Amino acid sequence: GYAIGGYIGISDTTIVDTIAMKMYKETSSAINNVYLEVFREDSTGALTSVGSVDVSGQLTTASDYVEATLPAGVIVNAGERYVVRMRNATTVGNRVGV
Amino acid sequence: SAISNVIDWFNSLLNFQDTTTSNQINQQNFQIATLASGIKKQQWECRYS
Amino acid sequence: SAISNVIDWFNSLLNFQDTTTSNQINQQNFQIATLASGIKKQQWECRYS
Amino acid sequence: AKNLATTDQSFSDDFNRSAMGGLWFLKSDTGTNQVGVSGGRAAFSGLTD
Numbered sequence: 001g002y003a004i005g006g007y008i009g010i011s012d013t014t015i016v017d018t019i020a021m022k023m024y025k026e027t028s029s030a031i032n033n034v035y036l037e038v039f040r041e042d043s044t045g046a047l048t049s050v051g052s053v054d055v056s057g058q059l060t061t062a063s064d065y066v067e068a069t070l071p072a073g074v075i076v077n078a079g080e081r082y083v084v085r086m087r088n089a090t091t092v093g094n095r096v097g098v
Numbered sequence: 099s100a101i102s103n104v105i106d107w108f109n110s111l112l113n114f115q116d117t118t119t120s121n122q123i124n125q126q127n128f129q130i131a132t133l134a135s136g137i138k139k140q141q142w143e144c145r146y147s
Numbered sequence: 148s149a150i151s152n153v154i155d156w157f158n159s160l161l162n163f164q165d166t167t168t169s170n171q172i173n174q175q176n177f178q179i180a181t182l183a184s185g186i187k188k189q190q191w192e193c194r195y196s
Numbered sequence: 197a198k199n200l201a202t203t204d205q206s207f208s209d210d211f212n213r214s215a216m217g218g219l220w221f222l223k224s225d226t227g228t229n230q231v232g233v234s235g236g237r238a239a240f241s242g243l244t245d
Contacts, residue, residue, distance in 0.1 A: 009141025078138040079147045115163065122170050126210045129177060134217060137186055176206040183203035195198060 004098060005039070005085030013077040019051075019084050020067040023098040025059050031094045032056045035087040036068055040080065047083055050074045056090070063097070212236040 019036055034056035039047035053068040076082065088096045138147045187196045209219070211233050216222065222230035232241035 007141055009143075010138070011140050012137050078135070081141060118167060122167070122174075123210065123212055125174055126170075126208065127213060129174065129181070130209060130213070130217070130219065133181060134219060173206065173208040177208050180203060180205040180207070184205060 001089055003085055003087045005083045007041070008082045008084060010076050010078050010080055010082065013075075015073045015075055016070065017073060018067055018069045019053070020065055021055075021084060021086055021098065022063065022065055023059070023086065023096055024063045025061055026095045026097055028061055029094045030092055031059060031090050031096075033087075033089045033091055034059060034096060035089070036066070037085045037087065038070070038074065039083040039085060040074075040076075041082065059096075210236075211238045 016038070019038060021036060025031055032054075034054065035052050036055050037052035038050055040050050041047055051070040051072070051074050053070060055066050055068045058068070059066060086096070086098060090096075213233060216231055216233050216238070220231070224230050226242060226244045229240075229242035229244060231238050233239070
């Protein structure tokens with residue numbers, strides 16, 4: 001139930017296809033409902049969701065990169081800001097270490 | 099028929115003329131826009147773009 | 148009058164010809180220069196440009 | 197890339213857009229008005245001398 005995210009700058013405009021974060025799981029118990037999502041920051045500073053993906057299946061106990069493909073491409077432009085949020089709304093209760 | 103052919107050729111030349119002028123204007127504007135925009139500094143390097 | 152009009156049209160076509168050639172040369176040279184120049188590494192990333 | 201053949205830069209501008217833009221450093225003795233593009237041509241902005 002605790003979500004953490006950071007702002008990402010855009011250097012050159014392109015089409016995004018995947019997002020990555022460095023995280024792992026503390027215990028070896030089964031986990032689910034771990035989501036990585038992307039938010040665009042508007043002019044007013046509000047965050048709008050433009051994509052999300054479940055990454056609980058491919059997580060590993062060892063600290064390793066997690067790369068997940070978005071459902072569809074999200075065009076980005078230089079000058080705007082984006083946030084990659086990890087949600088971790090799991091049901092079993094195993095914590096996530098980022 | 100000779101005058102009709104001259105009419106057709108002049109119309110074709112006018113079409114080519116306007117297309118070339120429009121293409122030149124569009125190309126130069128594309129150059130200027132690409133030069134104006136482009137790479138911007140990321141968020142961690144600076145606050146400003 | 149017909150020959151005078153032909154003279155005027157030929158002069159206009161020559162003007163368009165030279166302007167288009169000059170514009171083509173300028174556009175190509177500008178693109179080449181922009182490709183040659185551009186982003187350079189900052190002072191902290193490396194010593195050389 | 198210590199040494200490299202310096203390509204002779206060339207630039208062009210048709211002045212065929214909405215505003216002068218960031219590609220031109222503007223300085224005037226008027227105080228507020230600068231070179232303004234209108235009708236696809238650069239010109240003087242304002243009625244000041």
